[PDB]
Design a binder for these strands. Structure first.
Lengths: 149, 83, 71, 149, 83, 71
DNA sequence: ATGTACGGTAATATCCGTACAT
DNA sequence: ATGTACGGTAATATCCGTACAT
């Protein structure tokens, strides 16, 4: 199991990988590839060495102070729990942190639409926002630098 | 300038669109295409976060000033990352 | 359903088309079902938002007419 | 000396009446009559029984909660001080108060552009507003009802 | 619809106005007349007071709830009013 | 001075004229000196307000290109 | 020089017609 | 039925010309 950014070559496939939530699977199967190709987002996939068991999406954003946003993260039902989800979060943090070393980014936001995801991101250290930002959790670039010493 | 959009709609829909366009001092061309590409940005870019809130903005600024130490789960995940 | 059809034909830049059709497909609807729905909701918004302006003008002219004489 | 609303008849005249401030005299001599005729404001003048020694202007407003606004008030230099100015303020309050009995108005605002005027309206009971409303002073309709028992 | 406005201006002024009108997806007709009658309301009606401020709005609301008693000067002026 | 002339001709409703010419006279300037000054300040506003949008798009695409590979 | 002002012919852009598709 | 699509002639509205005034 390795994590890699989506390859712009055609015929990539990797059809179905149920994560439990129909919306995330639908986004993976009908939005992710085109939005990566059209530079709307940067899509990263976790799959085996034969060619998918997970994915996440990154997107530059502003809070203006520039940052990066993790909008979607999904893990197949055969990989139950938070483990490889947290590993994918660490991979995304490393990507955002190299990007901050390059062009300057002060933090990473993350979208949490349900309470299970809210608790998941809260167990990883993300700070809960309130009000109109109740579904958004934040983690600074300084903490990501601390993570990789 | 070079492309075009063709659609069909109800005379009720057209009456409403034309009335509001006239209220906006606009043709249905500019009203439709504005109200389209102005609302379409709201969809194709969720690249902005208006944290403005007395508690939320202060939480973000306290995170920027005082950065929380990486938790146990994040350290274990970083250990699981190398491979 | 219960309704019929009557067209509208407008012209844009292909770079604006792109941004329109992408958001249309992302909302799972045709370019027509996007453009028209967005235009209609905008049209209702600036059709009630003008009604409130007319109400304000009416009540202002009422207070103004009462700021004149005793009657 | 009597106070009366502007008469829509032509040839009213009453040329010059210096109050000290060139802006108020200019408004009286080149804006007041037309804006009253065009129903932009309601202009009241204090003059003798022969046909001006003062004036004020009223204008309906919203704070939405409806109210009335005293934008301009001027008293000739031959009538030095606050006396007839305060009497004109009382006349305007009575007008606003009858108007509240008629159509409903919850208060009266007043425009104060300099510190002398600020202190003048503060000596009459107007409450000082702050921030972007620093030049505006308010008096409720209940206090005007109290004034006339 | 029935009246018209005719003015003359610099080619620099016209270039600026036309550029901004194009940015607004508008003709110089609608840009000029909008930017005119939209900014002209700001002049011909000072009939609105946005008290929004933590202290100012609360002062106004405390005046509405607790109405201040008419001062001595206001009572003397009311006495001077009858005549 | 230092500049020349080049006209603009637009058509309105007389009820809109009224509201324009009144504010023009209240600002102590001709209808031309009103219309043109207001249009020019609006034009500069939405000419710098678009420059900031272009700056935002540029820096966003910079962060986006850096969110890709290590180089 | 520039503010105000009227109207006629160039320009535009609003409509239909026409097409095949679902 | 309706979404997508091309272009030709009606409609518009952008220009000048022309006017007297400051």
């Amino acid at each position: 199991l390795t994590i890699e950014i989506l390859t712009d070559d055609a015929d990539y496939d990797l059809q179905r990988f149920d994560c439990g939530e129909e919306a995330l699977n639908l986004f993976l199967t009908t939005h992710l590839v085109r939005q990566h190709r059209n530079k709307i987002l940067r899509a990263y996939i976790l799959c085996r060495n034969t060619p998918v068991l997970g994915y996440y999406t990154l997107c530059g954003s502003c809070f203006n102070i520039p940052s990066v946003t993790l909008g979607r993260l999904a893990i197949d039902r055969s990989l139950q729990g938070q483990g490889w989800g947290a590993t994918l979060v660490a991979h995304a943090m490393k990507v955002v942190w190299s990007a901050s070393l390059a062009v300057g980014i002060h933090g990473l936001f993350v979208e949490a639409l349900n309470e299970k995801a809210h608790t998941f991101y809260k167990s990883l250290g993300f700070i809960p926002l309130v009000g109109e930002n109740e579904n958004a959790l934040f983690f600074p670039t300084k903490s990501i630098e601390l993570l990789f010493t | 300038k070079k492309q075009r959009i063709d659609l069909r709609l109800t005379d009720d829909d057209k009456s409403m669109i034309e009335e509001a366009a006239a209220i906006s001092n606009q043709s249905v061309s500019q009203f439709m295409l504005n109200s389209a590409s102005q609302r379409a940005a709201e969809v194709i870019e969720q690249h902005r976060r208006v944290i403005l809130n007395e508690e939320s903005w202060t939480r973000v600024m306290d995170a920027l000033s005082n950065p929380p130490s990486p938790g146990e789960k994040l350290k274990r995940a970083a250990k699981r990352l190398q491979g």
